[PDB]
Nucleic acid binder design. Sequence first.
RNA 1: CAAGGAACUCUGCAAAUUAACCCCGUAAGUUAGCGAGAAGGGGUGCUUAUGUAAAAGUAAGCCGCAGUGAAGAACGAGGGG
RNA 2: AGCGAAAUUCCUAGUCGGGUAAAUUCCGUCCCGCUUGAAUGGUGUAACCAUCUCUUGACUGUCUCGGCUAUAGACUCGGUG
RNA 3: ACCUCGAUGUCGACUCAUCUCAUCCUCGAGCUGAAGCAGGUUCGAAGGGUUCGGCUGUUCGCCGAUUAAAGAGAUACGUGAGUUGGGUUCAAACCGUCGUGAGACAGGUUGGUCCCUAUCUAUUGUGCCCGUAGGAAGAUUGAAGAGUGUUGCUUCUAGUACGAGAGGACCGAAGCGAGGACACCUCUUAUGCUCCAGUUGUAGCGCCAGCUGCACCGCUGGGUAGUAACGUGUCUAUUAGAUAAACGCUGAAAGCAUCUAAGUGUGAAACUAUCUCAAAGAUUAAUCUUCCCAUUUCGCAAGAAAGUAAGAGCCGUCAAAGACGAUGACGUUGAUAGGUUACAGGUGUAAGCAUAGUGAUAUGUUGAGCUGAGUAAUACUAAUUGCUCGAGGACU
Lengths: 115, 119, 229, 56, 122
Amino acid sequence: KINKQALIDLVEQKQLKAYVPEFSAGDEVNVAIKLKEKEKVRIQNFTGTVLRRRGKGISETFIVRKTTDGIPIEKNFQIHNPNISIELKRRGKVRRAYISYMRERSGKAAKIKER
Amino acid sequence: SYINKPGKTSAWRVMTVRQQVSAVLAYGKIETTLKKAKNTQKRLDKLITLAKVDNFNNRRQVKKWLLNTNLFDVDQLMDHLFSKVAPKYEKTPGGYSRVLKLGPRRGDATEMAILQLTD
Amino acid sequence: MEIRGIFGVKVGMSQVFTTNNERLPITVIYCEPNQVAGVKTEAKDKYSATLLSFDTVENKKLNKPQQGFFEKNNLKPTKHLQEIRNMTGFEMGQQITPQNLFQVGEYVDVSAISKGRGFTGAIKRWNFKIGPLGHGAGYPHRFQGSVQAGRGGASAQRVFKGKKMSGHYGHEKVTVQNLRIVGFDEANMLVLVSGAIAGPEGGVVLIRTAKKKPGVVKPIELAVQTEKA
Amino acid sequence: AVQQRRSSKHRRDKRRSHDALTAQALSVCQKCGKKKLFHRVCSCGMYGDLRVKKAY
Amino acid sequence: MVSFMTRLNVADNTGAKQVGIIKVLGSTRKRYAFLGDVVVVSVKDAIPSGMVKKGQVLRAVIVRTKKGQQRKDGTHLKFDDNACVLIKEDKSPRGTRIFGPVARELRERGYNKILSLAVEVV
RNA sequence: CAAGGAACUCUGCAAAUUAACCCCGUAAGUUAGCGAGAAGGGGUGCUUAUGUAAAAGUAAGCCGCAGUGAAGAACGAGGGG
RNA sequence: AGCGAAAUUCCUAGUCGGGUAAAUUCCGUCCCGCUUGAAUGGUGUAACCAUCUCUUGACUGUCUCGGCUAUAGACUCGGUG
RNA sequence: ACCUCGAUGUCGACUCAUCUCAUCCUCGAGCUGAAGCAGGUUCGAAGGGUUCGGCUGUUCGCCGAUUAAAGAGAUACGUGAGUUGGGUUCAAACCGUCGUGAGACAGGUUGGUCCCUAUCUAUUGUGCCCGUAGGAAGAUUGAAGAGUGUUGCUUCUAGUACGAGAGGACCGAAGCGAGGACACCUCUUAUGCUCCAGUUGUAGCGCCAGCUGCACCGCUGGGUAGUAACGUGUCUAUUAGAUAAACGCUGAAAGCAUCUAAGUGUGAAACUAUCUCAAAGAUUAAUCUUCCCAUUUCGCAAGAAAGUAAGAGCCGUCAAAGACGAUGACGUUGAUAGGUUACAGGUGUAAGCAUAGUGAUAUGUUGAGCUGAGUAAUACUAAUUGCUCGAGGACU
């Protein structure tokens, strides 16, 4: 007769990963993507950082931005998405938990990383 | 349209709420619209909890919204409150104020209700 | 058809992951374990239906007509009672489970009430076009334009009955069919489904057999991440 | 958007027939008389079990 | 938004840089050109030293969408620029030098040669 | 207000964009008076030294996604009468 | 003389060409040219025009495609009316 | 030559369009000088749909590219108490012509002013009163109504049959679908005006520090819940009957035969059902059960005092609904709203301290701090120690 709507988390506790280290939108990562031709799943690496982290609980989707052949690809990955394995390369600096200026910032520079 | 009174703008209403939360500290009684009093009660309880924290940083936070009157200077008023009334009501889970609906105003049916403090 | 029906309430709305790597939004509906109030048939009561009761209450939380019939029915008091037409399988004084009415992957529909939002504009209730903004807009610039259907004597000179003029839009009886039954939970008596659900958290939910695809069933599995740390 | 004929007195009386003011509930002050409006204070300057103000 | 004269980039060795959507040949009121859609376009800027001309109505295929779109898996594909390529009404590119990567939402409808000359398959 | 960016409209009508300063840079016609603010681009914060009398002005460092961070300040080119 | 399909020309979408997927818009060609035409001034000229005016870089929520917020109204309550 | 000048608003464009078929297509069918396909003709046929732009005031018209077609007509070439005044028909100014001049041009040219506070009805929603023959409750019902009665592409069938070669099927199945109808803010986008962070200066807060007001919400960057789209998700088949055209069998007249006159099937997106929403004032106010009462006694047992005992209403905590009304939950027996506690999200290392530098500054404290609306408990505050009505079965 009395509900909780925290049992929503109880049923969500079946679709989660338990490997991803803590990240704060600016730690550079390399997410490997399992993609098929028809079979023999190949690896598509996607090196970048979290431009925007949006959602609620399981809905926490995060942007990852890469540049290939001068083309900027920004793609909204999910933390617990199958075949979306995130490898954390390094950690930068967190001015704020969200960034809206990587589009106005160019490459060729050593991005700041914590020592 | 063009030039007229602002009415109930957010800045206007927040300033008026600040005036009422200063006056309730000044005199201990407020007689106003019940619609204003019900919203004032929320921030009054929040400020009561903040006073119960009773920190110098809390002094800075409370300083932001208090206003000065003729007889109650801010330095005297806030120090007095934090000295005695901050722990006075420290044994109650909310409901730090109550509104009693009085008779309305004489002229234009302006509902007068009294907001006061309670345990 | 021998309609299978259950009563539940929406308790949230989110997404989930699946096997075969597709995104699957989740409307989560807690289905109440219902006790049947009775059965009517078209040959005995002239309308085939099953009366169900839910939202159990105490002896002092109901009007004495309904409560008195309900204790005469030998059923512990409940807030709400509703009949489902063409349903006769479930008879009075028995428990209703979500695992027998339907199966994991077949297609159903849900009768529900929309969310209360009051009056909405004609451009929203009927999806018309707004007037001009540039080249001079004037004060009235949002309307459907002309209402005249003819000038002069005996052309139209009026607006007949039954016109789609804006009014109360929302909080209305709706039903969307062919939505996937994503997940079952008999331990919690709960259902995860796909799509978008009308109404707020508290809107009535009546699950029934889909008219477009009653028996069509599709396979799908959830995604359980086995990626070790 | 203006009228062509005057409104009759009988029709306006029928229109004003549905017009009615608000309904007022009553209660009693807990330590004074003067039947008051429900959820409102009476003129005895005393709300029931109360006496914070004056009666002028 | 796909509409009349949607200026977008060119990603093949053709010698053109500005082309505008003049017609979307297909269903009525579609008013969108999803990834892989072949659309009727009028060329705005093209050098004669290249292998293309200007003004003539041709057919082109959008390869990049700056707003992006939702994929069937759940990850939102997105770019930062509108771009297209010029096709010769087949599964092969007019410009042999295909600049930039390609998506995987248009291989099921042919275009194997264009994706073959792409720098990567993603 | 993302996104196409004039397709809406008889027609870019309204709005939009520019805006203080200095640093460069500026074409054709021409009566040499003009064009011209042509057009086209950069940037200004704080601390230290140098700084002249205040200055401007420069260098070193430090940070912001951004530095007349509030304000008020210039859109332009070609065609025809 | 000169001008010109000149806003002056019904035929005009004049014949041709340019900007023109598209362009009775615009500008170049010729002069029977209803009703061109040299102090009704004509032909051009240098600048300028809150002048007409063709095209355009940005420019924009005009349109695409309508939407979010806010007050003041509208509406409720009260007084006047 | 008239109903209509004590006036009788007409062009376009927009918005909304609805109605009809001599129907453009989606559909069915016959014939063909219809191999197939492409088709054409004709018959039925309104269920639905039938483009975008540029120039031209433009309904007229021209051009280009498309889908299945980019149908027509009517509504004062529908409609300005709905919008603009592009245009038509304003003075004015100008070119050319005419008129001596006033001025005119069924010539061009430049711009050329759309008021209306809804009384009634017609209508869309929302309410109140009464009633349906004791009250009330639902569960209904469905008479009457409506929405819905759109469609294309690819592949397999199949280069198969056919055809000759070439050319190339009729149907079905799978996927993709475009459009619009409905719902949502979980994926994405904007807003998010008492959220956070940072920043500019002025006025201040007695100063450093830190805090506030003002300044396009000061600006900048976001953003909780929420709002919505530019975003997601279902939808176009189908069933039963009778079908139009049309295809039929048998069969009489006209001994044979002949879709019709008898008997008698098949067959279109047309019609009525299945799909969906509401629905007994539907005075035809329909059904069912339910709970309460039928309360000795005094004129009809006439209110005679006990006027439901079912409860409802007033009022309030309110949003669940939401201009108000009203709907709905809840009234101390309660978590009904608020507050408190803690959590989630957002937001982003709080203040202050140590550190080195003269100072800007940077390392740790610190993912700390804050939070309108999110989450679970808390009777802590406010729904009063409140009020009124409410059946005797009206009449056999």
